[PDB]
Structure 1
Amino acid sequence: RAIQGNDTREQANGERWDGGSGGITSPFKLPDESPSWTEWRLYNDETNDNPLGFKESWGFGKVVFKRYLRYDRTEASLHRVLGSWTGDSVNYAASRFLGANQVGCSYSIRFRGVSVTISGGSRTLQHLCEMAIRSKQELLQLTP
C-alpha cells in the first residue's frame, strides 16, 4: 500500500485485545490472558518466581504482536503455553507482512525478570523460531 506500515502496526497492537477471534492474521494460536490491574495487584501481596505468567511478543518489521499467558510452574501449564505459537503459525503470519525487502524480525519473552530476544533478518526467520521455542523452553524451566 501507500503508507503500508502505520495502519497495519495499529491493527497488530489491537490484535492482542481482540481475543483469539478478532483482528488480523496473528502468529499466536492462543488468545491473550493479560491480568487486569486489580488481579495483578491483589496477586502482589506476596510479592513480586512467582508471577502469574510471562509476556511474549512476535515482531515482523513494524508489525508487532504481543501476548501475556498465565504460566504456572507445572508440566501441563508448560505444554499449554508452548502451544501459543508454532513454526507454521509464525511463517504463515509473517507471510502477510514480509516482502522482497528484508525487514527485522524479533521474538522476545520475559519471565522471572529475565528477558530473551531472538532477533534476525526476515530471511533468517526459520532459525529464529527453532531458537525461540528452544529459548522459551529453558527460560520457563530455568531451575531457580
Structure 2
Amino acid sequence: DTREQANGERWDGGSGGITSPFKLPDESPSWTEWRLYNDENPLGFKESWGFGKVVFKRYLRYDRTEASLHRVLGSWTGDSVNYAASRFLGANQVGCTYSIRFRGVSVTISGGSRTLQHLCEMAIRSKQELLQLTPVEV
C-alpha cells in the first residue's frame, strides 16, 4: 500500500501529502520531448531512494552547468531523507538504497537502515562526483 503511494508520489507535482525524501518535483520529459530531444548530451539524470519496499524516484533536468549542478544537489538532503525514513522505518532494520544514473554509469549506495547517516554522506558525494566526471565535451 505505502509502496504504491511512494511510487505514485513521483507524479504529485506540487500538491501531495505523503512524506518524501525529495524536495524538488520530478521533471520527466513527455515521451514526445524525449525522442524530439534525441535528434539534437543528456537531458538529465535519474535517482531514487528506497526505505525498504517504499521506493521514491526522480528524473531531474541537468545541463552540466554550475548553476544547474547546485540546483539538483538540493534534490534531497540528510535531513529530508532522515525525516522521510523515520515515517516508514519501524523498530526494525530494513534495506535502504540510494541510486543514481548518468551518462551510462550507475552508482548504488546500500545497507541496513542503521547506517542511513553513512548512506547519506556516501550518496551526496557519489552524486556530485558522478555529475562532474570529466565533461562530455572533452
Q: TM-score normalized by structure 1?
A: 0.91
Output the CA distance in 2 between the equivalents of 1:24 and 1:41: 32
Conserved? CA contact 1:12–1:23, under 8 Å: no
The superposition leaves residues 8-30 of structure 1 with CA deviations (integer Å, 9 ceiling, x where unpaired) of 00000000001143141000000
Conserved? CA contact 1:20–1:29, under 8 Å: no
Conserved? CA contact 1:56–1:110, under 8 Å: yes
- Structure 1 segments, 4+ long, off by >4 Å, are none
Output the CA distance in 2 between the equivalents of 1:117 and 1:94: 18
User: Which secondary structure does the structure 1 equivalent of 2:24 belong to?
Assistant: coil
The superposition leaves residues 54-113 of structure 1 with CA deviations (integer Å, 9 ceiling, x where unpaired) of 000000000000000000010000000000000000000000011111100000000001
Output the CA distance in 2 between the equivalents of 1:52 and 1:103: 33
Equivalenced residue count is 135
Cα distance change of structure 1 residues 140 and 104 upon mapping to structure 2, 3 Å threshold: same
The superposition leaves residues 39-61 of structure 1 with CA deviations (integer Å, 9 ceiling, x where unpaired) of 01100013xxx111000000000
Cα distance change of structure 1 residues 53 and 88 upon mapping to structure 2, 3 Å threshold: same
Conserved? CA contact 1:11–1:23, under 8 Å: no
CA RMSD of aligned residues (A): 0.8
- List runs of 5+ in structure 1 lacking aligned partners: 1-6
Output the CA distance in 2 between the equivalents of 1:57 and 1:20: 19
Output the CA distance in 2 between the equivalents of 1:41 and 1:52: 11
Q: Sequence identity of aligned pairs in percent?
A: 99
The answer on 1:62 being equivalent to 2:53 is yes
Q: Which residue of 1 aligns with 2:15?
A: 21
